[PDB]
Amino acid sequence: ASGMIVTDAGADQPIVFVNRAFSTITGYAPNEVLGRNARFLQGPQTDAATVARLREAIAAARPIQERILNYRKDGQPFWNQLSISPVRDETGNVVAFVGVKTDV
């Protein structure tokens, strides 16, 4: 199943919701991740240029897809086919971001 992360739009995009699949994939319970930026999923071999593209896309509220190296709670690396999109209201204001870890 595909994991889903929802964050606030502003400040440092703290996580406000993760689905059940997220916990299966990552080994983290909601209470371990809520109120944190999702960058804690990254680790020593995560590609800097990929992180830079995510950073610029989120800052511009542009949808982006990247395959990024993440780490489970237990430290085991996994490939995250990650897609991030802004959630906008009808005035164009960004209300949230949604991230999907696609089950390929």
Next chain:
Amino acid sequence: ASGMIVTDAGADQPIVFVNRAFSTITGYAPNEVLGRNARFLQGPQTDAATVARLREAIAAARPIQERILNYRKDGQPFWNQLSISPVRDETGNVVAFVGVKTDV
């Protein structure tokens, strides 16, 4: 502040998350709405044709915007400028629905 509702994709789209603004707007606390279909917000003067258009859009996972009459927990009617979109993974599978009540 715009309200946001996140539901599961399947079965009867149970609510899995609401933002703070949702509680301000509707008078319902998260624990009062989690696991329910959002149709409880409708009442006696809600337009049946508008409900039917939402029903068909969600069944087909099509984005839709409607101005729909909803009711606060205390019975106060309010106009909901509602936009619903599917959250898709990169295979096209629907992972969730997101609804926004646009603050006008």
